[PDB]
């Protein structure tokens, strides 16, 4: 299928030129972020699966990596490990073992000469380097891979890295390394806002069990809550609901140092109490140092409550309660 | 209009896209036949479509009824039946069986129905409209004059005109639209009296206080075309008089003048200037097809330019077509095909090859397919300017366009290769085209011998003698032998390739059929034998020739 992909490349180039001409943009500056945008407009297919939508990419992404020819016209295989089944993986293993042996002999000679110039280049914790996954290795090597052979390759790579690294060995071992994303879970702290000559003004939002609450906090007033135009004592007759309001302020010892006005809609009494508690906790982050906001998030004030009522299932009573199952 | 797009009426699928003009006509005819068949079922079974769902109640899609509503009442049974031939004839008999009195308006429709559709039955109907009831002459002549004209009986129109003028009733403008034709169509050694009768009728037209419309001035020019080719003075005088009253002449009015000018332009070319300077004034305005006889206007106004070999005027006559209505001026496809072919006949050899090719792609595959005549002119356009890169492009389109005419255009399509030089960069174009024409005729179709001489020189400069030699064997076995010029030319290629084994087989078969240049071939082979050191075989073929 070597010629088929080549023909598809020319057809894709011609189609890209035509798409640029019909869309009105410069074909020279036409890129994939414009190709997909124009496709989504010309063929607006509304489907839940993204892969089912129309797509026009370069053939190298659409078609998978096709295996190259292995033997010439005379039938003689090119690579010397063709009859091993996996001529790419086994060649890689052979090269890795040869480099390991070269490193070992060079280190033995250096120790005989009583010289130590190498360093430990295996600790990549600050960089955030990891080993290749099976899919990543199968992307590099066109042939299919297994689990045991992948484990052997990883365990040989770590053996090679555990030895005094050479000059050309480090770059070879680095191409099998992948960077990981930031695992920091620190939330964004809203800056203090000053609106209408008002100092220490902040806003927060919360949601819990179909209840939306928006709370504005002023850091210069006394401690009181105004909910929906009425005081919290009147709006929450139940003491537990008022304890929900007290939970964030008591954790920060800011009972009588902030004035809060809340607007909460939806849900019941407890759902509204939870929503306003979450909104107040998220809004108080601006008035507190970075040390206690983490304490609040560890105490469970800055995290949402995904506990939502499950939909009732057909043939059941309450999405869990089954009907009376008669054995006979 | 798009360039590489088929007309909207045909399906856009390539398997349904027509290839030739006959296929294009046949597909439309088949589709119209299916439409008519469906309408036949709709009319024959009205009850299956009586239910209406569309709120606006569109009447165009409702079935039509062919049955008259009232049958017992003679008066009411004729109006329904006249509007819908043979059955209308029995209506008069059924009404007259009861001796029902017919007014002057009921019989007019019956007479018009017979006049529109339909020799002795006409007289039998004409006696029944006159002897039965004193009908008004206005309802008489409109049927009689218009019916007897198609029956080759114009003598009755003049007799009826005498009664019409005696009855103190003025003749409408439509009466003289046929009286002049009836008077003119009969010619017995005289023309001046026939033309003077038309002049007398025209003079009486104004006295009758009826303004003659454009139809009278259009029909006098219709009559002045068949008889005399020198009668252009009265035609031009009438054309001038048309502008005096204030009504613009129609397209057919100029078409009739152009037809006679085309007739008279063959002996003298001085009349072509009058043809050229009359269309300039009419191209400056936007026209509308208000006359059904305007189809031949462009057919005659562009054939003159095609015959006189004018392109600056062809551009203007095409602009005239494209100005007002690009399609509402040609009725039938035959006229369009005959128009575009000779229109493109002038765009090839006059202007440059670039503009010729530019106009080629927007007219040939888009509008209509050329005939066998345009193919010759397209070939003539290439060899004059030495255009060889576009030869395969024209050839591949010609396979689908002139496949029927291939057997007559193939001897001419390949002759251009013998006049130009073959560059070393043009080997594949000469190879694939020569292979595709040889792969079809030998698999089933006379094969001209001239193409072998062309294919011999196509591979001469390409250095491919292996493929060139094998084709000669296919022709020499077909019981036909070409001239020795090809053999002598290919002997040079064989000498260049150092293949003495080819000429020995060539001559032993060539000299056996008594070729006129066998002496030259036998002299030429001795020249190659000495340089190829084939003196042992030089006398070997001499012995065979002697034996």
């Amino acid at each position: 299928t070597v010629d088929f992909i080549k023909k598809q490349i020319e057809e894709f180039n011609i189609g890209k030129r035509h798409l640029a001409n019909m869309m009105g943009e410069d074909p020279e500056t036409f890129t994939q972020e414009d190709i997909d945008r124009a496709i989504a407009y010309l063929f607006p297919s509304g489907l839940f699966e993204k892969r089912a939508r129309p797509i026009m990419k370069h053939p190298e992404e659409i078609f998978p990596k096709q295996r190259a020819i292995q033997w010439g016209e005379d039938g003689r295989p090119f690579h010397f490990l063709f009859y091993t089944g996996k001529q790419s993986y086994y060649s890689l293993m052979h090269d890795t073992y040869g480099k390991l042996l070269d490193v070992e002999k060079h280190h033995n000679q250096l120790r005989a000469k009583d010289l130590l110039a190498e360093k430990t280049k295996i600790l990549k914790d600050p960089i955030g380097s990891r080993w290749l996954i099976k899919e990543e290795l199968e992307e590099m090597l066109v042939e299919k891979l297994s689990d045991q052979d992948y484990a052997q390759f990883i365990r040989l790579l770590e053996r090679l890295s555990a030895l005094p690294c050479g000059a050309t060995e480090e770059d070879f071992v680095n191409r099998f390394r992948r960077s990981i994303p930031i695992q920091s879970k620190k939330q964004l702290i809203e800056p203090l806002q000053y609106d209408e000559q008002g100092m220490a003004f902040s806003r927060g939002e919360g949601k819990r069990k179909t209840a939306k609450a928006e709370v504005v906090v002023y850091g210069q007033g006394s401690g009181r809550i105004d909910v929906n135009g009425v005081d919290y004592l009147l709006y929450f007759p139940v003491t537990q609901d008022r304890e929900q309001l007290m939970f964030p302020l008591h954790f920060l010892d800011r009972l009588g140092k902030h004035d809060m006005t809340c607007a909460v809609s939806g849900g019941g009494r407890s759902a509204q109490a939870g929503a306003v508690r979450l909104a107040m906790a998220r809004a108080l982050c601006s008035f507190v140092t970075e040390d206690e906001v983490e304490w609040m998030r560890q105490a469970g004030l800055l995290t949402a409550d995904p506990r939502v009522r499950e939909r009732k299932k057909p043939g059941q009573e309450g999405a869990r309660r089954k009907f009376t199952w008669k054995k006979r | 209009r798009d360039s590489t797009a088929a007309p909207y009426v045909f399906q856009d699928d390539p398997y349904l896209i027509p290839t030739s003009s006959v296929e294009s006509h046949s597909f439309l005819l088949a589709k119209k036949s299916g439409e008519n068949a469906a309408k036949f079922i709709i009319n024959s079974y009205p009850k299956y479509f009586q239910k209406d769902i569309a709120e606006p109640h569109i009447p165009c899609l409702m079935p039509e009824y062919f049955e008259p509503q009232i049958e017992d009442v003679s008066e009411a049974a004729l109006q329904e039946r006249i509007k819908l031939x043979x059955x209308x004839x029995x209506x008069x008999x059924x009404x007259x069986x009861x001796x029902x009195x017919x007014x002057x308006x009921x019989x007019x429709x019956x007479x018009x129905x017979x006049x529109x559709x339909x020799t002795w039955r006409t007289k039998n109907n004409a006696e029944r409209i006159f002897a039965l009831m004193p009908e008004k002459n206005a309802h008489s002549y409109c049927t009689m004059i218009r019916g007897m004209v198609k029956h080759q009986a114009p003598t009755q129109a003049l007799n009826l005109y005498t009664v019409l003028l005696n009855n103190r009733l003025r003749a409408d403008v439509y009466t003289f639209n046929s009286l002049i034709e009836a008077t003119a169509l009969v010619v017995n050694e005289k023309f001046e009296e026939k033309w003077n009768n038309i002049l007398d009728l025209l003079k009486q037209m104004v006295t009758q206080n009826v303004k003659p419309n454009l139809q009278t001035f259009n029909t006098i020019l219709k009559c002045l075309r068949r008889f005399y080719a020198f009668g252009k003075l009265p035609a031009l005088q009438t054309l001038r008089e048309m502008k005096a009253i204030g009504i613009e002449p129609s397209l057919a009015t100029y078409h009739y003048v152009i037809q006679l000018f085309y007739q008279h332009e063959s002996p003298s070319k001085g009349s072509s200037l009058i043809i050229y300077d009359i269309m300039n004034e009419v191209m400056g305005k936007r026209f509308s097809p208000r006359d059904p006889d305007d189809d031949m206007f462009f057919q005659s106004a562009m054939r003159v330019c095609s015959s006189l070999r004018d392109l600056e005027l062809a551009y203007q006559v095409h602009g005239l077509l494209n100005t007002g209505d690009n399609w509402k001026l040609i009725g039938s496809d035959h006229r369009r095909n005959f128009y575009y072919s000779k229109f493109f006949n002038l765009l090839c050899f006059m202007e440059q090859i670039d503009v010729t090719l530019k106009w080629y792609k927007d007219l040939i595959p888009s509008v209509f397919f050329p005939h066998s005549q345009t193919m010759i002119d397209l070939l003539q356009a290439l060899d004059v300017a030495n255009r060889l890169d576009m030869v395969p492009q024209i050839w591949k389109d010609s396979k689908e366009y002139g496949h029927t005419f291939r057997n007559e255009l193939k001897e001419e399509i390949l002759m251009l290769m013998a006049r130009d030089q073959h560059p070393p960069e043009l080997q594949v174009a000469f190879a694939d085209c020569a292979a595709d024409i040889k792969s079809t005729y030998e698999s089933q179709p006379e094969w001209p011998a001239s193409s072998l001489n062309y294919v011999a020189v196509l591979f001469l400069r390409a250095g491919r003698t292996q493929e060139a030699w094998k084709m000669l064997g296919l022709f020499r076995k077909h019981n036909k032998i070409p001239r020795a010029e090809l053999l002598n030319e290919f002997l040079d290629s064989a000498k260049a390739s150092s293949s003495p084994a080819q000429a020995i087989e060539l001559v032993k078969l060539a000299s056996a059929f008594s070729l006129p240049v066998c002496e030259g071939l036998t002299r030429r082979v001795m020249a190659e034998f000495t340089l190829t050191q084939e003196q042992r075989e030089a006398l070997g073929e001499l012995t065979a020739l002697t034996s």
């Binding site: - | 079922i41 079974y45 299956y48 239910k51």
Partner: protein, 49 residues
């Protein structure tokens, strides 16, 4: 009106425009059953005759 649809489709099938596979199968099965020997009895003789 199912009668309109049925009559129109049957008339088109008889005229040669629509091809009804279900009705063709019914006709084939009826032909085979009649050839076997168990057809449609005539009205007025099924019980008495």
């Amino acid at each position: 009106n199912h009668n309109t649809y049925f009559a129109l489709m049957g008339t088109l099938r008889f005229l040669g425009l629509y091809r009804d596979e279900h009705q063709d199968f019914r006709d084939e099965q009826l032909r085979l059953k009649k050839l076997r020997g168990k057809g449609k009895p005539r009205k007025g003789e099924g019980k008495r005759a």
